[PDB]
DNA sequence: ATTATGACGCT
DNA sequence: AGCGTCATA
């Protein structure tokens, strides 16, 4: 009743970058604008793997992952850009810094945490508050919307895309209550307002467009976000969630997508997150543990508390690189080389971040994969990063890793190594 | 032989 | 600490 928390004392943001690594090679050159084309790293092995893909390639059924070689078998005109290769080993310099660009544009409107290379939330609810008192109990215009859809909407008692959107958000304004500054429905929608201007700044300043999505959490942004996609917004309103939930799997929920996801729909036995609202919280904290069960008792509800946190800059900085099949390193000489390589990359990131953004790095992770073992990362050792010199930060690499090598000869390596990483972490003001 | 990252949870 | 999960281009 009364006393019932309804989730909607927030207005949350999700914007992300429409096919990022593809518009940034885009940018840069204009050949490749408005053409069905990919970005792929290495070349050698099956034309290389593809990391991003414009929306006209989608078309074709060009996905992440796939094989440019396979790529161009769906999509014979299929137009490639390479991924920068530095030391020997794939650069991801140039997407950096153009996710800079767009982080500070989205910096002036409002706190943002960097959920990833291409995309952010934004807490817009002081904003929201903010263009209320402007807006003088004056309603919001159509026009101010020109990209936003509002989920679930139209409804009740035109065959175009533009139409349709445009009928849902008529009814979606017609209903608007704009005397009321507390209107939960009416901070979204003030919401949407800002996103849409901030997203024209991100175009126009940058050359890039995005999608955003615009609800009082962020897995409902998030989920908003990727519902008209590419170069739009989309709108849920807490009312919406009840139909949207109903048909919604599981695994679509961020965090969901995985494991636990599997074991909701397995214990449980159902496949819709809506479903969720039958089970008690103690249920559900049976099954999943005290905090996933919490977690989701809420969330099924529209519900989640988590916060936007003030975060623009990455809390690691890393360099990585995998030997597959017959490429493992197998001598000493080899893996040194390596190391140094990765280390190289490591401090030149290092001492930029230094002098852009005040900090220092105190600790080195070191990761390695060995041949045969199917887990991602077969074992992490730290040691102190004290000084960003390559040759040292490579020498206490290998000294912390050197233990592994079961090769009964000092110069070979066994069983090979099938990855190297090196993260520097645990940074302090400086 | 997806790869190269990056954030957070568990014990 | 070191390992695991989930997610990004
Ligand atoms: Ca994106
Ligand atoms: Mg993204
Ligand atoms: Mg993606």
Excluded at 211 to 229: E, T
Excluded at 244 to 267: D, H, T, W
Excluded at 335 to 360: F, G, I, M
Aim: hydrophobic share 35%.
């Amino acid at each position: 009743g009364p006393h019932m928390a309804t989730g909607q004392d927030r207005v949350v943001a999700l914007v992300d970058m429409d096919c990022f690594f593809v518009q940034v090679e885009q940018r840069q050159n204009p050949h490749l604008r408005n053409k069905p084309c990919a970005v792929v790293q290495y070349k050698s092995w099956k034309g290389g793997g593809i990391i991003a893909v414009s929306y006209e390639a989608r078309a074709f059924g060009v996905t992440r992952s796939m094989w440019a070689d396979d790529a161009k078998k769906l999509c014979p005109d299929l137009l490639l850009a390479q991924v920068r290769e530095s030391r020997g080993k794939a650069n991801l310099t140039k997407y950096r810094e153009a996710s800079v660009e767009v982080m500070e544009i989205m910096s002036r409107f409002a706190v943002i945490e960097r959920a990833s290379i291409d995309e952010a939330y934004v807490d817009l609810t002081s904003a929201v508050q903010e263009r209320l008192q402007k807006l003088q109990g004056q309603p919001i215009s159509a026009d101010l919307l020109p990209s936003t859809y509002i989920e679930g909407l139209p409804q009740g008692p035109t065959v175009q895309k533009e139409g349709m959107r445009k009928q849902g958000l008529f009814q979606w304004l017609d209903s608007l209550q704009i005397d009321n500054l507390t209107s939960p429905d009416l901070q979204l929608t003030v919401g949407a307002v800002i996103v849409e201007e901030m997203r024209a700044a991100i175009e126009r300043e940058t050359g890039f467009q995005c999608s955003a999505g615009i609800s009082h959490n962020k897995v409902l942004a998030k989920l908003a976000c990727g519902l008209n996609k590419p170069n739009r917004q989309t709108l849920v309103s807490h009312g919406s969630v009840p139909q949207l939930f109903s048909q919604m799997p599981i695994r679509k929920i961020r965090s969901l997508g995985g494991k636990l996801g599997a074991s909701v729909i397995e214990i449980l036995g159902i496949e819709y997150m809506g479903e969720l609202t039958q089970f008690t919280e103690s249920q559900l904290q049976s099954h999943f543990g005290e905090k996933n069960g919490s977690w989701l008792y809420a969330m099924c509800r529209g519900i989640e508390h988590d916060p936007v946190k003030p975060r623009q800059l990455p809390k690691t900085i890393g360099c990585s690189k995998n030997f597959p099949g017959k490429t493992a390193l197998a001598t000493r000489e080899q893996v040194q080389w390596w190391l140094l390589q990765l280390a190289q990359e490591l401090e030149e990131r290092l001492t930029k971040d230094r002098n852009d953004n005040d900090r220092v790095a105190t600790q080195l992770v070191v990761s390695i994969r060995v041949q045969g073992d199917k887990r991602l990362s077969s074992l992490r050792r730290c040691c102190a990063l004290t000084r960003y010199d390559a040759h040292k930060m490579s020498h206490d690499a290998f000294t912390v890793i050197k233990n592994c090598n079961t090769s009964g000869i000092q110069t070979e390596w066994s069983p090979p190594l099938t990855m190297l990483f090196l993260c520097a972490t645990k940074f302090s003001a400086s």
